[PDB]
Amino acid sequence: MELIRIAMKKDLENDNSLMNKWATVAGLKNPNPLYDFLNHDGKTFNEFSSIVNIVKSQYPDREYELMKDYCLNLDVKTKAARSALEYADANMFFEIEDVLIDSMISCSNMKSKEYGKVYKIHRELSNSVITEFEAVKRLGKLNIKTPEMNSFSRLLLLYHYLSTGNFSPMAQLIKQIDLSEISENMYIRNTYQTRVHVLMSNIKLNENSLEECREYSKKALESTNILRFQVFSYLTIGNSLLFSNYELAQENFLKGLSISVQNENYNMIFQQALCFLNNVWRKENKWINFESDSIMDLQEQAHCFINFNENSKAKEVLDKLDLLVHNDNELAMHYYLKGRLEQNKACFYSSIEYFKKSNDKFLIRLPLLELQKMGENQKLLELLLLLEYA
Amino acid sequence: LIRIAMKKDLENDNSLMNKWATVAGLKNPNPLYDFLNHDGKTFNEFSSIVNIVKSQYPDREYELMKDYCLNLDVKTKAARSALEYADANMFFEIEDVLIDSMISCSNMKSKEYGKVYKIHRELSNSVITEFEAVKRLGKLNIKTPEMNSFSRLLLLYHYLSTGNFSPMAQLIKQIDLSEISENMYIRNTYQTRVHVLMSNIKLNENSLEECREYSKKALESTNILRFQVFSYLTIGNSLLFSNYELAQENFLKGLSISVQNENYNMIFQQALCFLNNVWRKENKWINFESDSIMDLQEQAHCFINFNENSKAKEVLDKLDLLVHNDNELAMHYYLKGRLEQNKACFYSSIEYFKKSNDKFLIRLPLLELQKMGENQKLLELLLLLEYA
């Protein structure tokens, strides 16, 4: 017996009223598929949302441990297993996902087959194992037949575009996603829908359309119970306030930390956000990470040093940052900090160039503001704001 | 009238029959006896009688084929060719009459020639918008390949004349003249139009060697004065910023071949006028009794060049009280920028140049910004970011 059902039966010996509470929580309408689930091995709810909501209702502290056991025990060819693979990916439960994947790639069901391979393509692209060109050739070679996977094959390319700083393809790619054509797996449709709101909030942030950003993240929140999406919605809300409302941006980051105390990844993400926030407002920055050699962390070290006129320390940092390799968005930021160290307009224009390449209208405000402080002509600034890169 | 003349010329010397047969590329005088003996009989390619009249009556080409074309049967292939000859020569009196007669006829291929050429001419003279023009063309659901060529030719003409350069490069590449097999006159002249249009596009892209090569090909490909006119114009314009003498030589060549024509004569005068302002030389080509934007801008430019800021301000005052397209506004902001020595005017000038995707004349505000010590990285970025 899987740990989840040992637990809910011993919990039922001691309280009988749980049966109708669990049946409401799972939206089951009558405890009969709940009897079925507890008494017969391999019996599966119809929608994965039922046991997830029970596990979150009754056993939240233990959610990972209980569904790592439930998920790695399901029949991989079933609909629950396919749902489990989406559950795994959305929570960054890569240990449950990679095992589910390398068992669906080999299995006998051609619907779980393709879920497996598409998610494998995703996870190889994420870990820089294959190029963007490999990913799209392997997906095309797959002849995707499910509506779920034609949705997710575009979702995975959006994730890659977002993390590489290649924002200009995203608005067009996301508009082709149509989730209303998923009729089979309502767990996958509800979760994918949450991914889109989160991504759409991301796209509107990089378009400097900040109210629509906050509105999309907020719809994202009201739509989900997955902690990962809540994390990135509070992150996105707070980033949208970076230039306008220090207190409210900080409040959103702290909210994200408070719900993610367990996780070291989520902890560092909000910590890095608070670090950029305090550098932007030129405040004392307790969130610098000095024992790191990632570009994000070294740039925030330079930025703070620059803010406090420690140009030797800043130049040393920017010396290190030179012997490293930047994506476009990262180079924009690099040129911006070089412009503030050396007070050189050409670094700010170089910074504007790469911001234009990556189609980031949000952070391009940092070089634009510095150029105006240097008395740059306002018409030229207008013209910079309106011209685009190829 | 055409054939009265050529047997009056045959009465006096018979050796013209082997000369007229080679010039019209006929291979043997059989279609020329054919043409001369039976009224309404037509050569296979419109290129034959055109090349003849260039041989024998260069003096009289217009009024004898003004007569020849306005007696052709409107439903023939020669008539359709004539409508191109007429269009190729901007003989609007002969084809506007051919046009409103071919839309009325009963033949479905000259049906289509007329109606597209009508859209062209209503688009040219601002009679309909580029919108209406394009929906009227689609409403024809055009089937001949010649007219699928020319329906894009006409919009290119419109983009060229409106200063809307960015649609043109992609529009012209869709043209495929290898699908015209029926009328080789329309394909050879369309061929020259493509060369001429291609020459213009490469000039607006600041690809000046390719520009000159397309114009030189245009010249070797034609005997039509209007395409020669616009080839020397484009060649001379490509040299505006580099080679004063070679630019003036091409304009003067163009002047020499268009001395009778008032339109073309003024075109080269205006090109020579702009050339001398650009090199800031004494400008004998200025037209002081004009109130077109081109002529007044050249007035201001020259005044600015020679430090007559009062005179330049007056001119620029009038030019304010008139209405500019994008490319004209660019030039206005450029000259205001030089008079007021104000960088913002140069960026405004660059803005409207970028809007029109003119990569040639934008060299004017960019050079001024450089003299005023503008940052070179910014100029690079201005050079390479583009408009929506």
Author numbering:
A (entry chain A): 1 to 390
B (entry chain B): 3 to 390
Paste lines from the article.
Due to the high flexibility of N-terminus, the electron density of the apo AimR DBD was weak, which made it challenging to build the structure of residues 1–55. After a strenuous effort, the structure of full-length apo AimR was solved at 2.63 Å resolution using single-wavelength anomalous diffraction method. The final structure of apo AimR contained two molecules in the asymmetric unit spanning residues 1–386 and a C-terminal His-tag. The two protomers within the asymmetric unit are nearly identical, with an average root mean square deviation (RMSD) of 0.159 Å. A notable feature of AimR structure is that it comprises a total of 24 helical secondary structures, including 22 α-helices and two 310-helices. While the first five helices form the DNA binding domain, the remaining α-helices are grouped into eight TPR motifs and a C-terminal capping helix. AimR and AimR-AimP are homodimers and the dimerization is mediated by the C-terminal capping helix, with an approximate solvent-accessible surface of 810 Å2. The residues L380, L383, L384 and L386 contribute to dimerization by engaging in van der Waals interactions with matching residues from the other subunit. The first three α helices in N-terminal DNA-binding domain of apo AimR show a high degree of flexibility. To conclude, we would like to propose an amended mechanistic model of arbitrium system in SPbeta phages, which takes into consideration all three relevant studies (Dou et al., 2018; Wang et al., 2018, and the present study): in the absence of AimP hexapeptide GMPRGA, AimR possesses a highly flexible N-terminal DNA-binding domain.
